[PDB]
Amino acid sequence: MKSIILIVLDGLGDRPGSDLQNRTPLQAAFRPNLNWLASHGINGIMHPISPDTSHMSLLGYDPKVYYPGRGPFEALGLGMDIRPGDLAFRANFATNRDGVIVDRRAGRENKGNEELADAISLDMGEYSFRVKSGVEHRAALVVSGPDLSDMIGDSDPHREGLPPEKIRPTDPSGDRTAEVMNAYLEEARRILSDHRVNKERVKNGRLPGNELLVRSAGKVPAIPSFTEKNRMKGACVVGSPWLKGLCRLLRMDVFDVPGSNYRGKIEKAVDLTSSHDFVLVNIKATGNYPLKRDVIEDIDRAMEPLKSIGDHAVICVTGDGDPVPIVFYTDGVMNDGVHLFDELSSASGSLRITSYNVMDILMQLAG
Template sequence: MKYVVVLGDGMADEPIEQLGGKTPLQAARTPVMDAMAKVSEQGIAYTVPENLPAGSDVANLAMLGYDPQKYYSGRSPLEALSIGVDMKDTDIALRCNIVTLSEDEAYEEKTIIDHSSGEITTEEAKVLIDAVKKELETEEFHYYPGVSYRHLTIWDHGYVADLTPPHDILGKQIGEYLPEESKLREMMKKSFDILDHHPVNQKRRQMGLNPANSIWFWGAGTRPALDDFEAKTGKKGAMVSAVDLLKGIAVGTHMLNLDVEGATGGLDTNYKGKAMAAVDSLTEEGADVVYIHVEAPDEMGHQGSVENKVKAIEFLDDQVIRVVAEELKKRGEDFRMLIGPDHPTPISIRTHSKDPIPFMIYDSTREIEGQKEYSEEAARSTGLVMEHGHDLMDRLLQK
């Protein structure tokens, strides 16, 4: 038996008037998931404990079977693992987004317009982070480029400062959300002067794109200590993701990290390439469990784009779930598949919520009486509630 997790990041939502009172998951054309729903188990699960932030870090740890109360040490340290930064026990990792701020006001009065700078390319972003690094790096603070708008700063002998995720304050004036730590705040202010008129951003403006004109620190944390996935579950695991957070979790848990050409973390990602890499890992590379993480629904939720969130879910259904299921059956493999988001990212708030997620577990070897569709409403209607989302992995593995 092979095991697959298809994680549509932020896929769950609330009913939207524009969609006739349906959620994006209900409105999307998802014939594969809906066919599975008729013979599968559905329910809801709480992936984010009340005392922890509703982040993809906490929620994906839970979906992988790691109790966040025990294993969570901050988001950025997990990304540091992916980038290959060997943190010391005295280091603090900080997520360093490059964001779009309004331009005319004093820094404290600026508004955050876009947490991802229009999903800036990794190539452009590296040039900008290198410019920041040249001006601001010291023995105390070190900068490392990541993927797209997601980068890393290591603070030597720092502390876990209370910092606000930029996607939580879209459209708001930033003054009251800036770090209390003066060193962090001053670097953010100086970064605007470095980046706002940088040639990369001048070109982006000419193309009608949002400039990436400031860094934004958040997600502080200490060096992580994660148990080996195979030792924990008895199964060899593989990870397919475009983002450093999930790649870092894979490094920390000693899962096989699968790199896929064209995997961007955006709506334009190489969905089929991810699906095929996952299947090959199960049938040719000895993996027992593969975790396919697709970031696009979450990004579209942050952008407030109803149309593109629906598209992302449709792409997930047709180019990931369909491809994986058909290929595994073609290769004679029995499999169980867990489908779900890590957390909701409702269009109405453009950020994550702690509401429970709808999940579905499909088994290619047996059919049960299921629901007419896979959706938030269908999952709630079954009455199955997993109070601890980290127990879902054991449920998938039938432990």
């Protein structure tokens, strides 16, 4: 069968703008390449997602079923690893003065937070705890080990003036997890209060991050790898740390092309059709309207090789009010009569689908 290449133009569809003579960036852009694919392809409007959730959907995973939770998402967003069965929380470095949280953010201080995060990444019996630091006070904690439950409360008391809460089970499956968590947050206090980083902050009158407030426990549910789920060997040409993470969660190989450099991404994706069956490419179009038009034109330019590989590949271009244009091109296909790729032209295409349909239509063409 043929290789598949899915290209997601992040941001895309826009609303008609006066500065482009009542046209969206997309309509205004010179895009012969995207237009070529429409002309020689099937076209339509994709409606994403019924009543984060999007790229997963395109990859064949129903979010209502496979979404890991806010917790695990923070972890991913911080270039962390998660596995199914992991417990993950949103976290804050905060200030605990005499058993009261006097600042849920440790004053937004950031300096030394990675070393803090490092110091409290440890093991305790069958459990391991991993923390990485984000912007300002932000962190994520991922816990691994046996029989973890997200039927537990927050440690965060959600306002200043209260002590950190003891984690309570919210239903009977949470009991053991709550014990393991309180034991771990006790250890974290002590390490943090005694850390070199916090002693210098106190000495310099900066707020110490002597406590880790934990919030939004989510257990990563069972997620089939990309191969298991789709019977394909897949890859991601992506830059977003959360997207890199998602792809790692799914055991797709990940490629971070240094760079604009739309070219290299399309060029790398093309080269991967030799090794893999499926390549997701994510492109950021992210400023005013002439500019947005201009980046779309830059993106079209980058897209030239795609005209030549339909003999051995299926190409898909889509974006991510609400609905978005979509094109499928492969060398055998019967154009449905639309000739332009835009929010209006593509609305005359044969396809009226959701992101959930994409993988099916991609497996069908391809053979």
